[PDB]
Amino acid sequence: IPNFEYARRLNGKKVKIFLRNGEVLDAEVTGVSNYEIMVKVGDRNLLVFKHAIDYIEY
Amino acid sequence: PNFEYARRLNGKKVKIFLRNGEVLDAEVTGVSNYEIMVKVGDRNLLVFKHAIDYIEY
Amino acid sequence: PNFEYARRLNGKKVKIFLRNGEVLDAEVTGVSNYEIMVKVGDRNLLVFKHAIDYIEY
Amino acid sequence: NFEYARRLNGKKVKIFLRNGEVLDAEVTGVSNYEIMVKVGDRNLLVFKHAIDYIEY
Amino acid sequence: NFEYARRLNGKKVKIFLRNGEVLDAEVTGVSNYEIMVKVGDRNLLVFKHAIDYIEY
Amino acid sequence: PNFEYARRLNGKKVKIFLRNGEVLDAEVTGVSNYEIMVKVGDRNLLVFKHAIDYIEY
């Protein structure tokens, strides 16, 4: 199926995002596109590039 | 054509060697074009293929 | 498809966290498929998206 | 879809990974993004993106 | 095929590579994935994926 | 359009500067979308473009 992806299923959910730089984000996913993921981390809004993510725990 | 070996890993116990040195002793629960779902102990993980060097199966 | 969240940043003051540890306090002046144009102080930079970890906005 | 990597199928090669490791390997399969190898007793799926170069 | 990098085709720019190296360069060519530069007396094909950003 | 300067390097002696810090004193024997084939001394290398930073030619 063209464009199928598991990351969409994380919308709305609270997850831990492990970045390639060692950072870990305690985040709530507010949006997912092909190449990006939108999250709230505390007071912060972040646009995270999927290419920068190693894995996500959910 | 547009074939990929990673799909055959669905259902299998593998060791995943990440680009940062970590190794996951995991069971593959799903595979898409860019991601691999695994259970590691009690932990549910979505792992991006770009962060994987190689997989031992 | 033809959607990206980065286009929403055009014209905004943001913090760009590069993959090299640098953090650019930037004004976004353009967004293309693979690049973001920013003014950092007096400098004009063309920043490749692949070099960006995330952006605070 | 032309690629040289396909021609390595069946060959003994040295795979230089992006972290510094090297693999003495027998190529058993090649897809668009992956190379399947046997390294001694081990079966590996190697992503091309993690490889720097290959000596054949 | 909209990209800003094409607009640099004749300009002197500073290219900041992913490994920390900096190039004082005059752009001579730009393709989808490459930028051709003269740095001093050297002729370089620089891959865009190796570039973090460019000051122009 | 599908244009890439690397095709011109076919046949030439060049210095390849890899993302890892290595330099290859190489003769280009073939070029595809994703790969460059080189002879470095008596050695035959398949070099992935993604692992190349730049090339002096």
Side-chain angles (χ1 to χ4, degrees):
Chain A
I1 306 148
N3 304 163
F4 174 83
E5 81 195 28
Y6 291 97
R8 298 192 194 105
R9 313 200 158 167
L10 298 173
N11 257 337
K13 316 211 283 193
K14 192 174 172 49
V15 305
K16 290 197 172 176
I17 302 186
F18 299 69
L19 306 177
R20 68 184 158 186
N21 67 15
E23 283 175 297
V24 183
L25 303 173
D26 259 343
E28 173 188 297
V29 180
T30 72
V32 175
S33 56
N34 287 338
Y35 300 109
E36 321 144 314
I37 292 184
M38 310 306 272
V39 310
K40 296 167 192 165
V41 178
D43 303 331
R44 304 201 287 152
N45 302 285
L46 315 172
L47 178 165
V48 190
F49 288 91
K50 286 174 172 183
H51 61 230
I53 299 174
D54 282 1
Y55 58 91
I56 304 176
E57 186 179 9
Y58 62 90
Chain B
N2 211 11
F3 169 86
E4 78 180 48
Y5 290 93
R7 303 201 199 100
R8 302 169 174 183
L9 292 169
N10 206 337
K12 294 181 183 173
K13 278 188 62 59
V14 298
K15 292 180 77 181
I16 295 173
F17 299 71
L18 304 176
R19 63 179 157 195
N20 67 0
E22 262 181 279
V23 189
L24 308 170
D25 177 8
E27 162 190 308
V28 183
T29 65
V31 181
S32 65
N33 284 10
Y34 296 109
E35 313 149 318
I36 292 174
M37 314 296 290
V38 310
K39 189 181 66 181
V40 177
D42 319 350
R43 307 170 71 204
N44 292 310
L45 265 46
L46 183 170
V47 183
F48 288 102
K49 287 175 179 166
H50 55 238
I52 301 176
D53 285 5
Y54 61 94
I55 302 187
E56 183 169 18
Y57 62 93
Chain C
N2 185 18
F3 176 90
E4 42 192 61
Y5 289 103
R7 283 163 183 164
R8 299 211 169 153
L9 306 180
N10 201 5
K12 299 182 59 171
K13 286 284 311 167
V14 304
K15 300 180 65 192
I16 299 176
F17 297 74
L18 296 188
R19 64 178 162 188
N20 71 354
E22 288 192 57
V23 177
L24 310 169
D25 283 290
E27 269 173 307
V28 185
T29 61
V31 176
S32 72
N33 285 331
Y34 301 115
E35 312 137 338
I36 305 194
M37 307 308 274
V38 297
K39 277 188 53 54
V40 173
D42 274 358
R43 304 161 78 200
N44 289 278
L45 311 174
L46 167 36
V47 189
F48 290 99
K49 290 174 177 180
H50 61 241
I52 300 178
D53 280 3
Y54 60 89
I55 303 167
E56 191 168 354
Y57 64 93
Chain D
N1 318 328
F2 175 53
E3 67 190 45
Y4 290 95
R6 288 181 203 157
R7 291 174 196 182
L8 302 179
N9 205 6
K11 292 190 185 173
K12 277 176 190 174
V13 305
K14 271 180 186 166
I15 298 178
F16 297 78
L17 304 173
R18 67 176 156 200
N19 78 328
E21 290 175 15
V22 182
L23 290 173
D24 289 351
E26 192 211 326
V27 187
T28 59
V30 180
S31 76
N32 283 356
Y33 298 115
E34 321 153 309
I35 303 190
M36 314 294 297
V37 306
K38 272 169 190 155
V39 184
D41 55 332
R42 329 166 63 202
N43 297 306
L44 312 178
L45 189 174
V46 182
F47 290 106
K48 291 181 170 178
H49 61 237
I51 303 170
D52 282 355
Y53 56 88
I54 301 184
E55 174 171 24
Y56 60 92
Chain E
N1 294 301
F2 188 43
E3 76 176 39
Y4 293 101
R6 294 206 202 94
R7 309 178 175 188
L8 305 164
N9 205 313
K11 308 185 178 187
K12 294 174 181 166
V13 302
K14 283 163 62 190
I15 300 176
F16 299 70
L17 311 164
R18 62 178 157 193
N19 74 351
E21 187 54 31
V22 185
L23 298 180
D24 280 326
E26 302 157 328
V27 183
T28 76
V30 175
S31 83
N32 283 322
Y33 297 119
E34 318 152 321
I35 305 182
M36 312 299 288
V37 310
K38 290 175 196 169
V39 177
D41 294 342
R42 310 197 291 151
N43 288 330
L44 277 37
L45 185 163
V46 186
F47 286 98
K48 289 184 177 173
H49 63 237
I51 306 164
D52 286 350
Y53 63 83
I54 297 172
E55 174 164 16
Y56 63 92
Chain F
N2 273 340
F3 178 87
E4 69 189 31
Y5 296 102
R7 295 300 176 129
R8 300 182 180 180
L9 302 172
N10 198 348
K12 297 306 309 168
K13 293 175 200 176
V14 300
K15 297 184 177 174
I16 299 181
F17 293 81
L18 298 178
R19 66 177 157 190
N20 66 1
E22 268 183 294
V23 62
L24 304 178
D25 211 8
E27 186 204 9
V28 176
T29 70
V31 182
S32 69
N33 284 331
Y34 296 92
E35 315 150 315
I36 297 178
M37 307 297 295
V38 291
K39 277 205 57 184
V40 182
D42 51 314
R43 302 168 63 210
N44 292 288
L45 270 29
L46 187 171
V47 191
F48 287 115
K49 281 174 186 185
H50 60 241
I52 299 174
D53 279 5
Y54 67 86
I55 296 173
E56 190 179 347
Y57 67 100

